[PDB]
Amino acid sequence: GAPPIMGSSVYITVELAIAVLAILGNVLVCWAVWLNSNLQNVTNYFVVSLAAADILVGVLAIPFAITISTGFCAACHGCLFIACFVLVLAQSSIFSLLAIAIDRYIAIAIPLRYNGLVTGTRAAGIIAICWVLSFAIGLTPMLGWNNCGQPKEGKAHSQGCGEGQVACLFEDVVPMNYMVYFNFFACVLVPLLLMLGVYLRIFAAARRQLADLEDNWETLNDNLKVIEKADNAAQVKDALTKMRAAALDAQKPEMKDFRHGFDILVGQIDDALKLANEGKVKEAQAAAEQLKTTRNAYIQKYLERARSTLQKEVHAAKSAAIIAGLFALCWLPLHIINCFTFFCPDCSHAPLWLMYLAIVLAHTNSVVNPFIYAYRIREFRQTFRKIIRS
Numbered sequence: 001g002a003p004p005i006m007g008s009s010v011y012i013t014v015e016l017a018i019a020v021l022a023i024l025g026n027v028l029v030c031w032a033v034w035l036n037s038n039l040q041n042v043t044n045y046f047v048v049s050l051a052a053a054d055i056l057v058g059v060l061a062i063p064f065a066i067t068i069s070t071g072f073c074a075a076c077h078g079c080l081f082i083a084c085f086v087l088v089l090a091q092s093s094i095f096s097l098l099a100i101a102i103d104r105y106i107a108i109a110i111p112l113r114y115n116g117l118v119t120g121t122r123a124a125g126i127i128a129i130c131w132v133l134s135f136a137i138g139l140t141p142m143l144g145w146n147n148c149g150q151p152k153e154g155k156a157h158s159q160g161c162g163e164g165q166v167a168c169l170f171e172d173v174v175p176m177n178y179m180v181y182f183n184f185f186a187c188v189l190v191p192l193l194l195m196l197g198v199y200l201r202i203f204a205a206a207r208r209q210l211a212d213l214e215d216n217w218e219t220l221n222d223n224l225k226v227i228e229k230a231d232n233a234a235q236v237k238d239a240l241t242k243m244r245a246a247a248l249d250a251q252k253p254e255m256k257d258f259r260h261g262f263d264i265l266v267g268q269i270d271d272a273l274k275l276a277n278e279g280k281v282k283e284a285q286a287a288a289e290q291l292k293t294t295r296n297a298y299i300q301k302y303l304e305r306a307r308s309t310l311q312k313e314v315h316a317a318k319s320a321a322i323i324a325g326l327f328a329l330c331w332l333p334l335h336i337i338n339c340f341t342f343f344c345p346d347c348s349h350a351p352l353w354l355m356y357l358a359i360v361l362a363h364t365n366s367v368v369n370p371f372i373y374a375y376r377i378r379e380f381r382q383t384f385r386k387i388i389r390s
């Protein structure tokens with residue numbers, strides 16, 4: 001058995017490196033949102049809350065994890081707090097990630113009433129509530145669901161702990177049924193599955209809306225061909241009645257030129273419709289040919305800006321789903337190991353070095369979020385450069 005301080009020195013040094021990187025990167029995230037007003041929206045208010053929890057990981061959780069790895073003597077309820085405070089920050093992260101996904105779903109499913117529904121003041125109240133719930137969930141062991149009533153008295157005396165103290169070890173004080181049933185299944189796994197379902201609805205909604213923009217555009221062009229090769233006044237009326245419905249369906253600085261374009265489009269369809277109802281088929285086809293001018297000058301531009309906006313919303317949702325996916329990737333090994341500890345008492349406990357590896361991997365998550373915003377969000381990246389240069 002090698003001396004514990006050799007392996008502990010590597011673990012501590014890595015933990016301190018992660019703490020420094022988590023603090024620096026996420027203080028930069030908060031600084032960027034504080035200065036740049038283009039970054040000041042509801043989505044980024046949860047981003048800041050998410051970054052604040054990552055800051056507290058390096059300031060408190062990582063020093064707590066270094067402390068509780070030594071198994072020092074402590075009063076059980078005080079030992080419970082340094083054991084469970086990281087569960088509060090992990091819970092806070094989950095609420096912020098679920099809020100970001102829900103916020104993006106509202107922006108893409110009901111964009112007309114997004115600003116009136118999702119406001120900045122309601123977001124700050126939600127964030128306050130989620131932090132209160134995160135403390136209550138994460139510090140539930142301090143409410144009585146703990147093993148302080150049955151202290152390992154042999155381990156406490158072997159380390160010279162005083163009366164009323166225990167050897168502060170996570171799996172000694174935190175019950176494993178809490179970690180698996182309450183923390184993992186109820187408070188971690190179910191919300192992550194809810195995020196997955198929200199993102200699936202987001203990408204399904206975007207794909208359908210792009211589909212609708214391509215259908216109405218093709219409906220417009222196909223009915224134009226029908227009018228050209230028609231032979232009576234009834235075929236022209238049938239095609240124009242479809243375009244007028246598709247134009248009004250599609251109508252539902254640049255907002256003034258696009259409203260003018262659809263006023264021309266629907267108006268010209270009406271001109272050709274009246275000429276068709278009068279039996280003037282040749283005059284109706286010529287009036288419908290003026291629609292091509294309106295299409296190339298106004299309607300084709302609306303379809304490309306609407307296509308561009310939806311593509312930006314997909315990219316933004318993909319970036320947010322990457323954040324929530326890496327969170328699961330970084331925390332699931334720790335939760336899976338707890339499942340083996342709890343559900344298989346005949347299996348040997350996962351080796352200590354694998355425990356150290358899982359703990360470090362979970363802490364690393366507090367570093368990766370500032371890199372995703374830099375590589376995937378131009379507004380964050382450009383603000384990051386201006387902060388670092390200045």
Ligand SMILES: CC(C)CCC[C@@H](C)[C@H]1CC[C@H]2[C@@H]3CC=C4C[C@@H](O)CC[C@]4(C)[C@H]3CC[C@]12C
Nearest residue numbers: 060073074075076077078079080081082165168
């Ligand atoms: C705002 C920031 C600075 C507050 C930080 C407070 C932290 C460092 C304090 C608050 C509660 C404290 C714990 C309270 C109770 C005990 C039991 C004792 O037998 C060992 C110390 C221990 C485990 C303390 C460790 C330090 C502790 C966790």
Ligand SMILES: CC(C)CCC[C@@H](C)[C@H]1CC[C@H]2[C@@H]3CC=C4C[C@@H](O)CC[C@]4(C)[C@H]3CC[C@]12C
Nearest residue numbers: 329332333334336337340347348349350351354
């Ligand atoms: C989250 C994604 C990346 C998958 C992570 C897989 C990890 C967490 C899984 C895969 C294989 C698993 C191990 C398989 C076998 C054993 C031996 C058993 O006596 C203790 C648990 C232990 C050591 C498991 C720990 C968890 C484990 C290492």
Ligand SMILES: CC(C)CCC[C@@H](C)[C@H]1CC[C@H]2[C@@H]3CC=C4C[C@@H](O)CC[C@]4(C)[C@H]3CC[C@]12C
Nearest residue numbers: 189332335336337339340341342343344345347
């Ligand atoms: C959808 C996914 C990500 C949810 C998380 C998967 C978890 C809950 C699953 C995946 C692998 C599973 C483990 C596979 C093997 C064993 C060994 C068995 O003797 C006890 C149950 C236990 C320990 C399982 C517990 C539940 C488990 C850890």
Ligand SMILES: Cc1cc(Cn2nnc3c(-c4ccco4)nc(N)nc32)ccc1N
Nearest residue numbers: 065066068069170171334335338355356359
């Ligand atoms: C080896 C080592 C251990 C701990 C104790 N510690 N913390 N967090 C945990 C979890 C957990 C958190 C979230 C989901 O699971 N699980 C278990 N078993 N121990 C934990 C702390 C530091 C080290 N190095």
Ligand SMILES: CCCCCCCC/C=C\CCCCCCCC(=O)O
Nearest residue numbers: 005008009010012013014016017020
């Ligand atoms: C731009 C960032 C520049 C560098 C930032 C700080 C780098 C921190 C690197 C590791 C610090 C490790 C401190 C050594 C303590 C070892 C613990 C021990 O002796 O047991």
Ligand SMILES: CCCCCCCC/C=C\CCCCCCCC(=O)O
Nearest residue numbers: 124127128131132135136139140142
């Ligand atoms: C602008 C958003 C501010 C976000 C921070 C919200 C401030 C409240 C923070 C946590 C209060 C903790 C109250 C304790 C609740 C649970 C008590 C327990 O279970 O032990």
Ligand SMILES: CCCCCCCC/C=C\CCCCCCCC(=O)O
Nearest residue numbers: 125129132133134135136137138140
């Ligand atoms: C795990 C502990 C569960 C605790 C359940 C009770 C906590 C939930 C409390 C209410 C959440 C919503 C608060 C609504 C604030 C209303 C104020 C307002 O609308 O202005």
Ligand SMILES: CCCCCCCC/C=C\CCCCCCCC(=O)O
Nearest residue numbers: 333347348349350351352353354357
């Ligand atoms: C590329 C994926 C990450 C690679 C680095 C991590 C490599 C080790 C990962 C875990 C494998 C499982 C190790 C088995 C634990 C010992 C089995 C036992 O005796 O109980």
Ligand code: NA
Nearest residue numbers: 053054093366
């Ligand atoms: Na986090």
